[PDB]
């Protein structure tokens, strides 16, 4: 059973950006589903996390618009 995280990407006005980001999220060597939301500001992913930093996947956002996208994470570490 997997760790489902949400990253809330307040990036641009469209937030279309999320799926551009999902392409990175859904390519990592530890993930079983990609589940983003663009009209909103959401990127959701099924993957391996807890005793390893979930903030890993945040770098997908940070690499397309560093210092810009207000991405907020559901985590506990």
Which residues fall in the annotated binding site for Cu(+)?
14, 17
Nearer to Cu ion (CB atom), residue 17 or residue 36? 17
Task: Give the residue ranges of the annotated binding site.
Answer: 14, 17
Stretch that binds Cu ion, among 8-16, 22-30, 45-53, 68-76 (CB under 5 A): 8-16
Kindly write down the DSSP assignment for every residue of 7-55, as one continuous string. EE---TTT-THHHHHHHHHTTSTTEEEE--BTTTTEEEEEE--SSS-GG
Whole-number Cα distances in Å, 8 to 32, 44, 76: 20, 9, 16
Binding positions for Cu ion, 10-39, rule CB under 5 A: 12, 14, 16-17
Residue 64 Cβ vs Cu ion, minimum distance, rounded to whole Å: 10
Footprint of Cu ion (CB under 5 A): 12, 14, 16-17
């Amino acid at each position: 059973n997997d760790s489902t995280a949400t990253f809330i990407i307040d990036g641009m006005h469209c937030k279309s950006c999320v799926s551009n980001i999902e392409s990175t999220l859904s390519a990592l060597q530890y993930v079983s589903s990609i589940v983003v939301s663009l009209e909103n500001r959401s990127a959701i992913v099924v993957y391996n996390a807890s005793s390893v930093t979930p903030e890993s996947l945040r770098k997908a956002i940070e690499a397309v618009s560093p210092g810009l996208y207000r991405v907020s994470i559901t985590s506990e570490v």
